[PDB]
Amino acid sequence: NPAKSASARGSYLRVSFKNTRETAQAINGWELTKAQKYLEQVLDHQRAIPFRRFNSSIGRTAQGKEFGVTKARWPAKSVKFVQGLLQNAAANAEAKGLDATKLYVSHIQVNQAPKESSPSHIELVVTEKEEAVAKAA
């Protein structure tokens, strides 16, 4: 339901496409708080991003073991854009009058932009996770 979601686009972004595909997918379907915290931890080298498609010559680390992968890296610039976005999406939702505590990145998505440059659009979309229910006899 659109009355429940807030989106935040960003376009023509001078970021490596390939890295973004990763940090996005990494964060796909996470409770916004646990999600934002995780991007701090990649910044501090606590946790790494499970690179999966575009991953040739990524040096294996234990931090990959969290996910199911051996290869994983810490990319700054990418994530810098993605938490920049999430921060925005959060604020959109607060204008829309939502519960931020239930929130989660329902659909994030990244596709290339016009061009040498290699720029890239991003659109993440966050949603209230709907619960709260009861019955009678």
Could you list the residues that contact another protein (CB under 8 A)? 1-4, 97, 130-136
- The one-character DSSP state at 63 is G
46 contacts RNA (rule: CB under 7 A): no
36 contacts RNA (rule: CB under 7 A): no
118 contacts RNA (rule: CB under 7 A): yes
Nearer of residues 59 and 135 to RNA, judged by Cβ: 59
Q: Measured between alpha carbons, how far is 97 from 4 in angstroms, rounded to an integer? A: 9
Q: Measured between alpha carbons, how far is 34 from 103 in angstroms, rounded to an integer? A: 10
For residue 12, the partner it binds in RNA, another protein, none, with Cβ less than 5 to 8 A by kind, is: RNA
Q: Is-contact 103 18, C-beta < 8 A?
A: no
Q: Is-contact 9 42, C-beta < 8 A?
A: no
68 contacts RNA (rule: CB under 7 A): no
Q: Measured between alpha carbons, how far is 76 from 56 in angstroms, rounded to an integer? A: 18
6 forms beta bridges with 126
What is residue 5's three-state secondary structure?
strand
For residue 102, the partner it binds in another protein, RNA, none, with Cβ less than 5 to 8 A by kind, is: none
Among 4, 18, 71, 102, the residue binding RNA under the rule CB under 7 A is 18
Binding positions for RNA, rule: CB under 7 A: 6-13, 16-19, 21, 24-25, 28, 53-57, 84, 87-88, 91-92, 95-96, 107-112, 114-115, 118, 121
